[PDB]
């Protein structure tokens with residue numbers, strides 16, 4: 001079957017792993033549990049296509065940048081995740097995008113901008129600004145909550161659809 005190699009990237013603590021686990025295991029990890037590198041594989045049906053999601057969950061930490069090149073290079077699609085209550089994470093997005101373009105030798109890699117933690121009242125990043133950014137990239141912006149599961153399948157399935165259209 002078709003396999004889709006999705007990579008989840010972003011700053012430390014934005015909820016990359018919480019999003020992935022919510023997708024694969026339908027629960028919200030409300031734990032402190034920093035990632036080094038995790039992989040998940042799940043057979044799904046998306047729009048009637050039987051396929052395998054190969055999801056690489058990456059570290060937000062600066063120390064793991066080398067293994068970051070390695071993982072990025074094999075990815076077909078990237079979820080670029082920030083937290084809507086953390087302005088630095090949103091600013092860091094630019095640098096993850098640029099590193100993906102560099103390792104992939106590509107200006108237009110399948111990608112979704114994901115604004116996570118939208119369940120939180122204490123927003124510092126407006127939806128308007130994140131949308132403008134995504135528009136300037138030529139990529140969809142999806143807002144998610146790993147906690148309530150809002151937008152979770154949306155973000156992953158939209159990325160699969162971007163890979164199909166590439």
Ligand SMILES: Nc1nc2c(ncn2[C@@H]2O[C@H](COP(=O)(O)OP(=O)(O)NP(=O)(O)O)[C@@H](O)[C@H]2O)c(=O)[nH]1
Nearest residue numbers: 012013014015016017018030034035060117145146
């Ligand atoms: N309210 C809320 N909290 C969330 C959400 N997603 C993650 N969190 C919380 O934020 C913290 C970090 O999430 P986690 O999934 O470990 O983030 P990460 O990006 O994988 N961290 P790392 O880069 O270290 O692997 C956890 O305590 C988690 O419960 C969300 O959508 N809403």
Ligand SMILES: [Mg+2]
Nearest residue numbers: 016017034035
């Ligand atoms: Mg993690």
